[PDB]
């Protein structure tokens, strides 16, 4: 009686961790840390 | 009277300090300080 499936291993409950691990390279940019962010309401912003 | 064992040294009680001093070279590693440490429940971990 060990961890071999034919020797009792079928009683082991399956474990899954739903925390998805992103593997895409992506892209990083830091403009939003230095640039002015204004809130618009229509379709064109006038200053 | 003196510290020689034959002249009154037999009354001096033995002194021992029970803290062991490890002398092995050992091995140092710092991967556990940068690596993710999940906890498992069965025999295989799935993500």
Automatic annotation (TrEMBL), chains A, B:
- In terms of the parent sequence, the fragment covers 251 to 297 of 543
Protein name per its UniProtKB record: Phage capsid-like C-terminal domain-containing protein
Organism of this sequence:
Mycobacterium phage Che9c
Q: Where in the cell is it found?
A: Virion
């Amino acid at each position: 009686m060990g961890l071999t499936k034919a020797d009792g291993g079928y009683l082991v409950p399956f474990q899954l961790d739903p925390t998805v691990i992103i593997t895409s390279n992506g892209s990083l940019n830091d403009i939003r840390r230095f640039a002015r962010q204004v809130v618009a309401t229509g379709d064109v912003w006038h200053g």
